[PDB]
Write a protein that binds this DNA or RNA. Sequence first.
RNA 1: UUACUAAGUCUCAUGUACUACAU
RNA 2: GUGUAGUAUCUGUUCUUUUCAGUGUAACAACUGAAAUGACCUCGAGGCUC
Lengths: 25, 444, 188
Amino acid sequence: EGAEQVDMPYWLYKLHGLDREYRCE
Amino acid sequence: ELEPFQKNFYIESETVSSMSEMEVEELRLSLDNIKIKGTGCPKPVTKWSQLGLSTDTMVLITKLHFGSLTPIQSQALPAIMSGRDVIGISKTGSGKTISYLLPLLRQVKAQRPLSKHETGPMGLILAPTRELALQIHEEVTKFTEADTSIRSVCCTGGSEMKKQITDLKRGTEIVVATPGRFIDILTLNDGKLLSTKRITFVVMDEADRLFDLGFEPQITQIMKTVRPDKQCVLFSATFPNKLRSFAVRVLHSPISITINSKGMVNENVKQKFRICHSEDEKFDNLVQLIHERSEFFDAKAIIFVSSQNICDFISKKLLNAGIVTCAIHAGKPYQERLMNLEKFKREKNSILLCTEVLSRGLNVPEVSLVIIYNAVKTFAQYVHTTGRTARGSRSGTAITLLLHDELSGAYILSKAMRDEEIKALDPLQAKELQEMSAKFESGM
Amino acid sequence: LSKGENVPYTFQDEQVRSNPYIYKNHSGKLVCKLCNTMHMSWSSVERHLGGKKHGLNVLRRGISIEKXXXXXXXXXXXXXXXXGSVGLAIQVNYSSEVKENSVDSDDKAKVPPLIRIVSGLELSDTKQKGKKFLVIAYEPFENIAIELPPNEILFSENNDMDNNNDGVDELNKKCTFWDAISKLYYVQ
RNA sequence: UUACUAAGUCUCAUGUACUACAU
RNA sequence: GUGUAGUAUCUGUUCUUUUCAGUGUAACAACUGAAAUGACCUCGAGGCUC
């Protein structure tokens, strides 16, 4: 009511070491 | 021990089934010169309603496709809906996609649902590029949207595999894929995430491209894991030897459908016309034509007329004006037909005068000139009359004397002539032609 | 494949280049100064340009390139009750066209009185505190307060059907009326 | 004022050398 | 100025079953096995969730 109109580095990020999320404590 | 299934879902509408063979030939010529090969091809349809689709689907399609059925749609839809293997050669943008989707939807719908242990799919569509697969799958979804009994998953390269594995976990009635990814998914995890056992329908779109992009090995292996009584259709803009060879390997009794590959009339025939405004002017042109020809001196001609009464009249007319013709028609005793035919085949630079209906069967050699004195009214008759001059390299000329009022005749000429044939003639004659044809066309 | 363009050597001390990147070093090989990659043939050069590697170095190089009369009005408090609890209602009266005859320049004149709940934790004297006040304010007249010992009274639950003209706050739209014709502000 | 590190694997093509072997 | 077999090296291209456990690894990598299905909430992340 009232809606009127008018008128990539795939293997590289795994290699980097993001196969296992690392953490700094 | 394979599970039997239904592939023919087509009920020919009464109006279509009433069509005669000559009618069907004519319809194909008018639809951009559809050419078929194979046995038992169903007749083309000309209306979405001749296909027996629910109202939902009808509404949806229209919506989905705007305007008249394309030539590819007219012929491929009933052939595929009938369960036949089909080779469809037509350009991208010819609407080929719905030509296979509708029958595929129907076929998958009819099968029993996937059991709790069955992965699917039942239907598989292969494309050579990610971009095409995505486009096809978008179409599919516009149909699977309404109906929750049917899913499609799009499986391509240049895209996360894990993402598509999550889909295929849930089972799927339809897969749209590029060949490599599909094969990769089939072999993955002992082939336990995707089965080919329930595939009854395979489509390969832009098939020529699949060989171009190196997919012969993949599509060949896929067809080897698919039951050989599957229905398979191959759509492609061209028909390279590789595809020709592949079709023989994967198809049964295929119907091939080619849209206007070559011209309806042999391209070596020079088609011309002259627009006249009185029968008298037509006759003046006919005579000028017959004399003019002499300055270019075998060389014989055939004037085609539409009736036996016209043939007699024009014969006498041409006589009174110093021109002798060999006149032929089926109201004449066969003995005199033979006399005239032999006189024509005997005498140098002879002129046959003949009714258009006898053209296909005339037992004479090709001639240098056909003058169609009464513009023909069908594409089939235009082919048979003009084909009397067709001769590969030695093809001559066919000229139609058209009257201002002969709209359907202009429609035929505008459809059977080459663009460059219409260009070389007077631009006003040409313009009248196009106007005549447009008027006839909106007349329906 | 070179399209007839002349790529000058790196040592020739730079005619505008199509791409001022691919050069030829002291040797005959072709190099991308950004990418620091050597290329044997112009076809390999075009593979380099059409490759994502070179593009990334182009974006990195672009990133490198970017780098008050105070008059007490009269209130009329009154213990109200409806259903299902007890609420308070105040009736504040204002001037009878006595002094408002000199100021009529549409300067917030259309703005009605406003109420807010203030904690006594902050006062000009800061002596005692621990209760709330239902302050009511109007431009010329002086502010007014009403102590509310009860933690909660008349604090309703979705009275109207969630219509969003915040005005000032949920409190004002929810439970105030401004009889501007008679100059009477009711609050409950 | 930007405090100095990127290619890898696969696939299907191109670039270039090479090694036994025969006229 | 050729052919048979075969090799190495660029470059282009691209990211393979989401997880778990074992081998393996300097850690990776790689390899070996299995497989959830359903429901809900907030902004691909998250759940002493069922």
